């Protein structure tokens, strides 16, 4: 009955999808060939996998995912990888040319090449689903397929499916870490397109997760695998209550209601605790109050945006493990009595608590230690107006000289979309300052 | 002469491998056994109440005085 269709667009989205589907296969006991390990006795005759893996009449558990990227490799790496038998051949869609860090290529010329095919696959998966909780779109604002085609797919999904829940996982561009030059252009255009065609877009960024891996896990070479493993743990703690028994159950259609106060303010943060290594987990108690304080500590954030400079508007706490609601209430009340954490005056009831009995899952060969309790904290501070200001300053800095505009012009968009995108983001910044005051 | 250990070995194939570990048992089953057995509530526990399941109508034509 619970159904989440997971669309991974972009190279970042596809790699994060690899990590998250490895995590779900491990959590539901599905081997990489897509079958139960030659037994139907683990969990009995269970169908708790139905939230992620469609099941045929023979034991093959095909997932409910669509992996889309215009460029070859990466998706073809999934095709020729260890999880080759698990994924359906039409579930992995690949074009000929690459979007090449171009929002115009992703949105007008090359993105519209594959959008009918991707929508057809999404339609078949939705018709196979017995009642959708929503879509989970994994992408990055860096540019190209994860920006232009992601915005186009969201726009067409808003056309077709109406008021269906769309939960987004965006690798937001880091404040100083960057791997491209047109990241502000692509981010401004994608945000302007997807202000109205979105519900709740969780943000992560590579710089803050690098700092997390350096400080907590003590990894001096964090590659994208570790980053995607923490993102997989975040999305698994998000979706755990649809598939595991919990004291307080939260589903996918409550994250918009409990975290979007106003229709343009739909860009929440993300935090996971306790992100810890084995030698530090041997020392630390990792109690409920400790991890609850660690979530609101302004060093465990994964968005690289100090929330002391902003005011909390909403929070969604997702506890999992052998956590008790009595200590949950005690810790979340001590946070409210604490003065470092500051809330808006118009939201006294600013928390949504969801408790799940299932302990966190330890991947083999991973970096996180084995913990009995965990919190996935989902804040909605107005501190992100700082990041919007820095991004808008970069956009104006490259836009006054009209640099890199001729690529977008030659690939199918004029100056009007640039101008109205910057106007919309300035209006968004004024909205953030107004909702802050 | 290609280097042997980092010569041709892709990141996903070296990191997103098939899961295999001797500690998969602890993932889904605790090695610590449960330290109790609990039966249902019994008749010696529901009838330890003095004069249990009797009402005030039963003292009529009973021959015993009312100390209850």
């Amino acid at each position: 009955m619970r159904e989440c269709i997971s669309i991974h667009v972009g190279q970042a989205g596809v790699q994060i999808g690899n990590a998250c589907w490895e995590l779900y296969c491990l959590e539901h006991g599905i081997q990489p060939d897509g079958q139960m390990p030659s037994d139907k006795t683990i969990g009995g005759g269970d169908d708790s996998f139905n939230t992620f893996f469609s099941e045929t009449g023979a034991g093959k558990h095909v997932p409910r995912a669509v992996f889309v990227d215009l460029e070859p490799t990466v998706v073809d790496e999934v095709r020729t990888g260890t999880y080759r038998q698990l994924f359906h051949p039409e579930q992995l869609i690949t074009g000929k040319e690459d979007a090449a860090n171009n929002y115009a290529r992703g949105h007008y010329t090359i993105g519209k090449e594959i959008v009918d095919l991707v929508l057809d696959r999404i339609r078949k998966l939705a018709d196979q689903c017995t009642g959708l909780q929503g879509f989970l779109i994994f992408h990055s604002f860096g540019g190209g397929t994860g920006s232009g085609f992601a915005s186009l797919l969201m726009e067409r999904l808003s056309v077709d499916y109406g008021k269906k829940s769309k939960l987004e996982f965006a690798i937001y561009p880091a404040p100083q870490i960057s791997t491209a030059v047109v990241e502000p252009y692509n981010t401004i255009l994608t945000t302007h397109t997807t202000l109205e065609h979105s519900d709740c877009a969780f943000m992560v960024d590579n710089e803050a997760i690098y700092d997390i891996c350096r400080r907590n896990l003590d990894i001096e070479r964090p590659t994208y695998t570790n980053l995607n493993r923490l993102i997989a743990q975040i999305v698994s703690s998000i979706t755990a209550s649809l598939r595991f028994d919990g004291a307080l159950n939260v589903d996918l259609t409550e994250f918009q209601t409990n975290l979007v106060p106003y229709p343009r303010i739909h860009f929440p943060l993300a935090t996971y605790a306790p992100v810890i290594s084995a030698e530090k987990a041997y020392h630390e108690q990792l109690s409920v109050a400790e991890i609850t304080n660690a979530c609101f500590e302004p060093a465990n954030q994964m968005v690289k945006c100090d929330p002391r400079h902003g005011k909390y508007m909403a929070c969604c706490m997702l506890y999992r493990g052998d956590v008790v609601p009595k200590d949950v209430n005690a810790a979340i009340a001590t946070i409210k009595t604490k003065r470092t954490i500051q809330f808006v005056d118009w939201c006294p009831t600013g928390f949504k608590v969801g408790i799940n009995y299932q302990p966190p899952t330890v991947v083999p060969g991973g970096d996180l230690a084995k913990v009995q309790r965990a919190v996935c904290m989902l804040s909605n501070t107005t501190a992100i107006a700082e990041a919007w200001a820095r991004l808008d300053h970069k956009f104006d800095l490259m836009y006054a000289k009209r640099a890199f505009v001729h690529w977008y012009v030659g690939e199918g968009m004029e100056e009007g979309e640039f101008s109205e995108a910057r106007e919309d983001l300035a209006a968004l910044e004024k909205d953030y300052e107004e909702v802050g005051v | 002469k290609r280097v042997p250990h980092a010569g041709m070995k892709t990141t996903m194939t070296s990191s997103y491998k098939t899961p295999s570990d001797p500690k998969m048992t602890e993932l889904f089953s605790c090695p610590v056994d449960t330290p109790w057995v609990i039966p249902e509530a019994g008749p010696i526990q529901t009838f330890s109440v003095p004069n249990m399941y009797t009402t005030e109508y039963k003292t009529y034509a009973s021959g015993k005085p009312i100390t209850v």
């Binding site: 290594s277 084995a278 030698e279 | 002469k1 280097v3 042997p4 980092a6």
Partner: peptide, 26 residues
Amino acid sequence: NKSLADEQAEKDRLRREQELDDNFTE
């Protein structure tokens, strides 16, 4: 957690040996 840390240290040592072998077959 002790077993995890021990096998992570063993994997780190094997990493160091492999990278040293690559550097010396350069």
